[PDB]
Amino acid sequence: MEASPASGPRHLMDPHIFTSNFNNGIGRHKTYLCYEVERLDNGTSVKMDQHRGFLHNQAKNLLCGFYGRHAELRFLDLVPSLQLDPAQIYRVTWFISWSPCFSWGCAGEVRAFLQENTHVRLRIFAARIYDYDPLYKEALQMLRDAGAQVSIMTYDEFKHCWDTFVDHQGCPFQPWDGLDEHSQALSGRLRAILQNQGN
Ligand SMILES: [Zn+2]
């Protein structure tokens, strides 16, 4: 009920940088984390333009004291610089390509965040699963008890997240040939973990 939803022709990742990065079917590259900040007003979610961004894993300077750190951590590191205003409600959307790590390290950090700032809705989206151990399981549960929304990246999210996290300057998304395949596959996995009753 207001003109129309804006885009983001600012300085976003290059069309290719995004695709190649989210190249469905990886094995080793660099975890990606796209955080989106939005305010909740009477069911009316207003997506901010100059408040969102994206990060990438880092592990090549552990000699300077900055031991290997995940994007999730290096990310929240900017929250203190935003001095959020709990005055109202907020909506932080997480877009991850790589599954979480030590459910206690990554998730834990978030858990406390909510337990202290439950005035914000955190949505977790896992596009690709890849870690050191299958611990990702406990991560799904430990998080579930947090209230956060855990789900696998969807096609609809790909289109939005695309034009949203890209300087498409007004260009469509390029999906690979096999969405129902990788989608049904991944989605099938999550469900499995979500299936702990009935039999
Ligand atoms: Zn982590």
What residues does each domain of the chain span? Answer: 1-199
Element (H, E) at 126: strand 120-128
Cα distances from 56 to residues 31, 109, 138, 180, in angstroms, run: 6, 18, 23, 28
Binding residues: 70, 101, 106
Has 72 been annotated as catalytic?
yes
Strands 120-128 and 89-98: parallel
**Burial of residue 123, with CB atoms counted within 10 A of its CB: 0-12 exposed, 13-18 middle, 19 or more buried:** middle
Tell me the sheet residues that pair with 3: none
CA of 71 to the centre of ligand 1 (A): 7
What is the amino acid identity at position 3? Answer: A
Binding residues for Zn(2+): 70, 101, 106
What was the experiment behind these coordinates? NMR
Active-site option among 2, 38, 72, 157: 72
CA of 69 to the centre of ligand 1 (A): 8
d(CA 49, CA 164): 9
CA of 170 to the centre of ligand 1 (A): 33
Instruction: Please answer whether residues 101 and 132 qualify as being in contact, where contact means their C-beta atoms are separated by less than 8 angstroms.
Output: yes
Q: Write the CB contacts of 185 (distance below 8 Å, at least 6 apart in sequence).
A: none
d(CA 70, CA 56): 8
Q: Write the CB contacts of 126 (distance below 8 Å, at least 6 apart in sequence).
A: 96, 99, 100, 150, 151, 152, 153, 190
The pair of structure tokens assigned to 13 is 């990742």
CA of 128 to the centre of ligand 1 (A): 14
